[PDB]
């Protein structure tokens, strides 16, 4: 046939798409898990982006091949839907194609393979749902401490993980709020982590409220407030100006005198209007005039100047104060009574090393707290802030999700035995496909073992043995839900170790990976133009 | 066109320049010799599909058979092979110790020469460490043979030598060879492997073997005589067939009756020939080739025991024990060159009749192990285990000193030598430390052949030795890379086997290091 392009058919087209998807998987295979190896990304210009995150690699990975682009489009579906598990998807889909391509050489049609993989994903989601654990073990049990402890042990904080783990679990539960029909989620903006030179790391205290790195200035004001009213004004009480880009042109010398005298005078109404509202715990963003600070001394208000915008943003969300940018309501001037006033119970400025941090207590509805990392030097306080911030999201992801599942290859190892037994029940040119779907899942624990510098053949075999014994009989002597510990190089029960993942990840990753291999297996020809 | 080859003026031989490291090349020839036998080391040694010079297929793991069939042409490798041949003298084991250890000394020497250390200083360190090893090896002697001539004792210590030649069947072979060795140890100061012979017979399996006294021969007695106590044994190499006259002896026959007359004259002559055997007071006769039909009945006429030995080595085996030498003529009545024996009889063992030369009148210090196997290649490989097993106890007739095996001594001897090099100042410490790391190659060989990460074995073997737990070796197991005590398991090596192996291996390595250029010649 004569055409204005090129065509290529046969079984080799399946193999070419198989080796392509297999190549893309090997680019993100060794970088699987938390001990994944970094990889270079040589751009067209010459920059080199070094990273180990599989999602960041696939976003920047540029392989001009159709089958590879299907997995790149597949990555966006998993990132938007869930935001995790993209690396396991490309690896699972690559092994299903390499195994299916072998079946096609045994005269197994792809339609029979596509049918087997669809039924295997259905039964796998059933076995997963039947072997979950709901979001529980919060208080009175230990479905957390071991989770956060294992996450922070990488840094120097791991000397005493129990002491710091309790500060995470107690605060992670403190930031709970339903807010939609019994949803409860947890905020990404989390407990503020300050620090101090408290002579040792053990001196770090857990506070039941927000901590701010500011001071009232003049000592005439009180440091122990109980008034519930909390003011929040972004308009500065100092010398106001038109704009940094607009200088008020002034010519006459006498006009400059009354501008100085009036501006000093107008604040006497602004300060009387602010003091009349009764707010004692006052916070100002754009600074406060020196004479205005003296007015809070006689009134006894706990005013603070030059408060950070973002730290103040969380205080308005805490006490519920309406953030006001200007006093003038387009014709006059007012403080907007009962608008910028919050609701609290007590505010006391405690004594902390080198910076007197103010503590707010029992706001209206904040769902936040503060921790002061009292340590030896900045190197430890800067490292513990990163460890706690990582471990904070480890427990947050578990309690936010409604159901979880044992990770570390426990799902892939359990399904390897169930689906292999389910294959013997169906038959009809689908027993081999469901069996290869079972064997393909073992790449995840086999890949995680290689990255952990251990014998993958032995650990993968040890997982399937503890999981197979669970199927033979339900006796308690047979271990159950055994995962894979990467550090010690030995299987471990993830329920005690706290290695949990969301259920939607293992469910969507098996579904999306199955749909991808189906999309490529149906390709038996290529037409170029 | 210049510049041509540098330092090439002797018959155009391949002279490696200063950049090409002529010394590094002779070492590579010795490293390749180790890899050919590094895998066959230990009980889990890998077999070698050896193709004999007669285009015969043999699967074996014995080192001496590998090198004997592998034509080693490199002279630098011949020196280490000559040490293996010298290892066979004064001991019948530790051959691969010479190949693996010497290969590690030379392989590790390259790391020193590459730094810049002189070859003459490397030799002084190995000679110092070899002298130091001989002082530490007596301190590692754990047990010693009681010399009670107990089969329970001899078989227990013999298990270590039998393994790594024929693994799995170390129980039967240890009992049989113990029964053969114990029966000669009463002959104080005369034990030798030449007495304990081996006779392979096609049979069911190795379990069907046993031990019998005297020089046993698999070929049953062809004659009809069951037993005969005659001392005079007449051995002839020429077979019983149609005679030929050494002179002219022209035989002309025309008619058919003359054919029958000459045929009768030959039978009457052969009847006189066998008559002469009995006339010389000898009721026993041996034959190399075929045996005639009429001469067979003549052997039964005078009750002369007919014997058939087709193998040449079987004939020479008798020539040096009884004295009966083979003559070129067919039945010459030469009574002077006949043999002497106390008893000759037939015996059926394992459903097979075998000729026996037992010493009933005499004290007797000779035995034979009758092996049974369904394959000739299998019995030959089991025969090699008998030599390495019997020779292990020929050494125990000397000073009885056993040391732990399984790489246990190699780590302790390395640990003791490494400490001597750390405290010894100067340049000799570099070669002394590498002499200790050469010992680590032997546990690394056992671990690699068992499917275990070798670095994990060395890490564990050094930890238990750091705590003072000597006599700890590699636990041979596929799914267990841990270690165990060699004393409790009963694994023990010979002292003289390690002494002469460390000595000959160092001399072979030093002899190769002393050489720096191979040059051709002509007479």
């Amino acid at each position: 046939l004569s055409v204005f392009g090129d065509r290529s058919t046969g079984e080799t087209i399946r193999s070419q798409n198989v080796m392509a998807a297999a190549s893309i998987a090997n680019i993100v295979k060794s970088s699987l898990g938390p001990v994944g190896l970094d990889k270079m990304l040589v751009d067209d210009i010459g920059d080199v982006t070094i990273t180990n995150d599989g999602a960041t690699i696939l976003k920047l990975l540029e392989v001009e091949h159709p089958a590879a682009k299907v997995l790149c489009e597949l990555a966006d579906l998993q990132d938007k839907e869930v935001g995790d598990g993209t690396t396991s998807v490309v690896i699972i889909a690559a092994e299903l194609l390499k195994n299916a391509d072998e079946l096609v050489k045994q005269k197994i049609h792809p339609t029979s393979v596509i049918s087997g993989y669809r039924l295997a994903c259905k039964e796998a989601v059933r076995y997963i749902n039947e072997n979950l654990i709901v979001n529980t073990d919060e208080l009175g049990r230990d479905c957390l401490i071991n989770a956060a402890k294992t996450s922070m042990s990488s840094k120097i904080i791991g000397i005493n993980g129990d002491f710091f783990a309790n500060m995470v679990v107690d605060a992670v539960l403190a930031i709970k709020y339903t807010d939609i029909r019994g949803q409860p989620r947890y905020p990404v903006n989390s407990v503020n982590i300050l620090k101090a030179h408290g002579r040792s790391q053990m001196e770090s205290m857990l506070i039941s409220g927000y901590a701010l790195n500011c001071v009232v200035g003049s000592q005439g004001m009180p440091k122990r407030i109980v008034n519930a009213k909390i003011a929040c004004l972004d308009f500065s009480l100092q010398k106001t100006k038109m704009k940094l880009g607009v200088q008020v042109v002034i010519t006459d010398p006498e006009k400059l005198d009354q501008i100085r005298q009036r501006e000093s005078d107008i604040t006497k109404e602004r300060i009387q209007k602010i003091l009349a509202t009764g707010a004692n715990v006052i916070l100002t963003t754009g600074g406060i005039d020196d004479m205005c600070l003296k007015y809070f001394v006689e009134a006894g208000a706990m005013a603070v100047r030059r408060v950070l915008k973002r730290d103040l943003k969380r205080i308005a969300k805490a006490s519920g104060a309406t953030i006001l940018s200007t006093l003038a309501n387009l014709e006059g001037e007012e403080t907007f009574e009962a608008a910028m006033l919050g609701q609290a119970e007590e505010v006391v400025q405690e004594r902390i090393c080198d910076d007197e941090l103010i503590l707010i207590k029992n706001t209206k509805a904040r769902t936040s707290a503060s921790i002061i990392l009292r340590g030896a030097n900045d190197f430890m306080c800067d490292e513990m802030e990163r460890s706690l911030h990582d471990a904070l999201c480890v427990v947050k992801r578990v309690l936010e999700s409604k159901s979880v599942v044992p990770g570390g290859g426990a799902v892939e190892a359990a399904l390897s035995i169930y689906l292999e037994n389910y294959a013997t029940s169906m038959g009809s040119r689908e027993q081999l496909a469901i069996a290869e779907f079972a064997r393909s899942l073992l790449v995840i624990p086999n890949t995680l073992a290689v990255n952990a510098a251990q014998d993958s053949t032995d650990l993968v075999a040890k997982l399937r043995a503890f999981h197979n014994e669970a199927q033979v009989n339900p006796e308690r002597k047979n271990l159950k839900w055994i995962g894979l510990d990467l550090s010690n190089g030995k299987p471990r029960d993830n329920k005690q170790a706290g290695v949990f993942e969301p259920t939607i990840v293992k469910v969507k990753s098996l579904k999306f990976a199955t749909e991808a291999a189906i999309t490529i297996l149906r390709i038996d020809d290529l037409i170029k133009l | 066109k210049a510049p041509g080859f540098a330092q090439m003026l002797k018959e155009g031989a391949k002279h490696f320049s200063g950049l090409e490291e002529a010394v590094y090349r002779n070492i590579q020839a010795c490293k390749e010799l180790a890899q050919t036998t590094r895998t066959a080391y230990g009980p889990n040694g890998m077999n070698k599909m050896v193709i004999n010079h007669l285009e015969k297929l043999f699967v074996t793991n014995d080192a001496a058979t590998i090198l004997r069939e592998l034509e080693v042409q490199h002279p630098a490798a011949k020196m280490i092979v000559m040490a293996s041949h010298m290892q066979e003298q004064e001991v019948g084991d530790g051959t691969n110790f010479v190949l693996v250890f010497a290969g590690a000394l030379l392989e590790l020497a390259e790391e020193l020469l590459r730094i810049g250390l002189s070859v003459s200083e490397v030799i002084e360190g190995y000679e110092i460490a070899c002298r130091k090893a001989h002082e530490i090896l007596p301190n590692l002697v754990c047990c010693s043979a009681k010399n009670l001539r107990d089969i329970d004792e001899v078989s227990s210590l013999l298990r270590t030598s039998i393994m790594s030649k024929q693994y799995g069947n170390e129980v039967f072979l240890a009992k049989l060879i113990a029964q053969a060795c114990v029966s000669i140890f009463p002959d104080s100061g005369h034990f030798n492997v030449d007495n304990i012979r081996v006779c392979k017979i096609l049979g069911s399996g190795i379990s069907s073997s046993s031990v019998l006294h005297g020089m046993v021969f698999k070929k049953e007695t062809e004659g009809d005589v069951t037993s005969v106590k005659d001392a005079k044994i007449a051995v002839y190499s020429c077979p019983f067939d149609g005679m030929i006259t050494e002179t002219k002896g022209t035989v002309l026959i025309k008619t058919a009756e003359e054919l029958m007359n000459f045929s009768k004259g030959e039978e009457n002559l052969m009847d006189a020939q066998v008559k002469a055997i009995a006339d010389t007071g000898a009721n026993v006769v041996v034959t190399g080739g075929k045996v005639a039909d009429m001469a067979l009945h003549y052997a039964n006429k005078y009750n002369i025991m007919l014997v058939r030995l087709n193998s040449k080595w079987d004939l020479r085996r008798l020539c040096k024990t009884v004295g009966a030498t083979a003559l070129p003529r067919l039945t010459p009545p030469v009574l002077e060159e006949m043999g002497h024996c106390d008893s000759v009889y037939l015996s059926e063992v394992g459903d097979t009749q075998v000729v026996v030369f037992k010493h009933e009148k005499e004290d007797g210090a000779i035995s034979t192990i009758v092996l049974r196997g369904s394959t000739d290649n299998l019995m030959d490989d089991i025969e090699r285990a008998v030599d390495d097993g019997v020779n292990t106890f020929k050494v125990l007739t000397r000073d009885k000193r056993l040391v732990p095996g399984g790489g246990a001594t190699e780590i302790e001897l390395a640990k003791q030598i490494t400490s001597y090099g750390e405290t010894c100042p100067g340049l000799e410490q570099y070669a002394i430390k590498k002499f200790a790391e050469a010992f680590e190659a032997i546990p690394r060989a056992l671990a690699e052949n068992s499917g275990v990460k070798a670095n994990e074995v060395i890490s564990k073997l050094y930890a238990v030795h750091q705590e003072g737990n000597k006599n700890v070796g590699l636990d041979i197991e596929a799914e267990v890379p841990a270690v165990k005590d060699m004393l409790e398991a009963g694994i023990l090596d010979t002292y003289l086997g390690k002494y002469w192996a460390i000595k000959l291996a160092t001399n072979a390595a030093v002899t190769v290091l002393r050489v720096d250029q191979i040059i051709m010649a002509k007479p």
Partner: protein, 512 residues
């Protein structure tokens, strides 16, 4: 196209090792030279490790990482950069345990990161404090750079310049004791004079030229003014140019141009100043008022350059000139001088105060000798920065390397596991530093390096290093080769962190 598998790590090792083999002999006072064939057939015979790699073309990305990490070292520390690449190349050159033993990089990286914490601890043990109050000790310390240079004739001059200069910038009251040589110690050259005339100006020197003669030539009490806005007619929000064709409209747009520039200048001169310093430019009409006021015209002064002025004379920054209050006056300033010193104007606003900043005056006889004095003084300022930030020195001449290596080798005896082998290999990699110092002098490397390790075993490890000039062994207490601690710790971390980086690479991938 791309690389994958064991070929990557072994390839990154050969690239990093190859870059280190270039500058192996560029270490020490007896450093060897290198010949760089230019594309035009020219040659440069430099012996600087930074300059060599800067001019060499590299294809492997691993080499670009080694070179780019060395440039980051030069910005922080102008010394010891050659030791980073050599150690990083030697730590990576041990490929026996990496691939031939089939160990995973995580096993190696865990050992390299364990040794780094031990190397850091050992260096602090063999350290020694310094009495920074006594400048005599800092002279012997700073002589490590002045040695083998043309400025040896005025060696003490370079120390007093760099020593006192960094002490002014050092604001210890903030706790961390930060120093900024780039900003608060701006250096400017002055033609004329000789090397002896080089000194430090206790102020801020602006290289602005004199546009008109009607300017203050000499003042005893300057009065400096500061403002960011430009002295020109107020334009619109956009950059639209004013196009006019009617003559009657010219006088209107012209009068607006003159009055606004006139009124703004009238407020600047109300305080009776001596010099108007503006961040932006100053037009011609605006300068007509400055020359009429008999004050100096200055422009194009950056933010930090103006911040130092307000600390020196006591001026105050203002957005526009109209809001100039009486506070913006440089009372207490030493003097204002715009003298043409060496065919070039220089603005001196020196005073008797130390406003956390200074300016170095590089006098000289020619531009060739000025540049020689310039680059030689910057390193002396950095050595003063490294000592004043952490007054602890460690024994040089390869002593700190051999001293640390003995600690790991003795500590590895209690290291049960497979990590002991690479842990000891890092110790043997530190020996390369005296290996190159001995190779350059010509003495036998094996004979001295062997005896050198024996001295650290028996005698104290704080001494008994190597003499690069003579080649024999010598105590660092007898020879002032003492180097700072912050340079060695950062040199040790950057070598391990760099080697850990390239070992973590297993796939060189292309894509954007």
């Amino acid at each position: 196209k791309r690389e994958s598998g064991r070929k990557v790590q072994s390839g990154n090792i050969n690239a990093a090792k190859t870059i280190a083999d270039i500058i192996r002999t560029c270490l020490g006072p007896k450093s060897m030279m290198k010949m760089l064939l230019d594309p035009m057939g020219g040659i440069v015979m430099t012996n600087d490790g930074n300059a060599i790699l800067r001019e060499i073309q590299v294809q492997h990305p691993a080499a670009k990482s080694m070179i780019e990490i060395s440039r980051t070292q030069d910005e922080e520390v102008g010394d010891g950069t050659t030791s980073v690449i050599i150690l990083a190349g030697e730590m990576l050159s041990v490929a026996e345990h990496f691939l031939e033993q089939q160990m995973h990089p995580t096993v190696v990286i865990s050992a390299y990161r364990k040794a780094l914490d031990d190397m850091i601890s050992t260096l602090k043990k063999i350290s020694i404090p310094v009495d920074i109050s006594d400048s005599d000790m800092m002279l012997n310390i700073i002589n490590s750079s002045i040695t083998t240079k043309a400025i040896s004739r005025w060696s003490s001059l370079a120390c007093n310049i760099a020593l006192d200069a960094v002490k002014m910038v050092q604001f210890e009251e903030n706790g961390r004791k930060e120093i900024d040589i780039k900003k608060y110690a701006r250096v400017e050259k002055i033609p004329g004079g000789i090397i002896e005339d080089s000194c430090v100006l206790r102020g801020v020197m602006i290289n602005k030229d004199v546009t008109h003669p009607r300017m203050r030539r000499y003042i005893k009490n300057p009065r400096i003014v500061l403002l960011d806005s430009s002295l020109e007619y107020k334009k619109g929000e956009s950059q639209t140019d004013i196009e006019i064709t009617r003559e009657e409209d010219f006088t209107r747009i012209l009068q607006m141009e003159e009055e606004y520039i006139q009124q703004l200048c009238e407020d600047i001169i109300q305080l009776k100043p001596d010099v108007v310093i503006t961040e932006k430019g100053i037009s011609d009409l605006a300068q007509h008022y400055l020359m009429r006021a008999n004050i100096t015209a200055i422009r194009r002064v950056r933010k930090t350059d103006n911040n130092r002025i307000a600390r020196a004379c006591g001026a105050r920054i203002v957005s526009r000139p109209e809001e100039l209050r009486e506070d913006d006056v440089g009372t207490g300033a030493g003097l204002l001088e715009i003298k043409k010193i060496g065919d070039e104007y220089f603005t001196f606003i020196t005073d008797c105060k130390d406003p956390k900043a200074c300016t170095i005056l590089l006098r000289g006889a020619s531009k060739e000798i000025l540049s020689e004095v310039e680059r030689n003084l910057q390193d002396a300022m950095q050595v003063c920065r490294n000592v004043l930030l952490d007054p602890q020195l460690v024994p040089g001449g390869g002593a700190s390397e051999m001293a640390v290596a003995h600690a790991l080798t003795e500590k590895s005896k209690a290291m049960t596991g497979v990590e002991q082998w690479p842990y000891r290999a890092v110790a043997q990699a530190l020996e390369v530093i005296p290996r190159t110092l001995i190779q350059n002098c010509g003495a036998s490397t094996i004979r001295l390096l062997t005896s050198l390790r024996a001295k650290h075993t028996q005698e104290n490890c704080e001494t008994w290093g190597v003499n690069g000039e003579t080649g024999t062994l010598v105590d660092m207490k007898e020879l002032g080769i003492w180097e700072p601690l912050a340079v060695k710790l950062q040199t040790y971390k950057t070598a391990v962190e760099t080697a850990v980086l390239l070992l973590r690479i297993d796939d060189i991938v292309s894509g954007h």
